Amino acid sequence: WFYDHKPLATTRFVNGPTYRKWAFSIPQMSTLYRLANQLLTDLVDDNY
């Protein structure tokens, strides 16, 4: 589903076609956290 227009919009993971809420699992979120890594900060806390 990664490259659909409104991915998961019809599934249980998001409320419906109005596309207002989402609720993922940890396999989903961790795969996504990996794919984003080129854009993300390495910082673990605000103290920096």
Cα 32 vs. chain centroid, distance in angstroms? 6
Select 2 or 43, whichever has its Cβ closest to other proteins: 43
Select 1 or 23, whichever has its Cβ closest to other proteins: 23
Residue numbers at the binding site for other proteins (CB under 8 A): 14, 19-27, 29-30, 32-33, 36, 39-41, 43-45, 48
> Minimum distance between the CB of residue 4 and other proteins, rounded to whole angstroms?
14
Q: Under a CB-based contact definition with an 8 Å cutoff, are residues 22 and 14 in contact?
A: yes
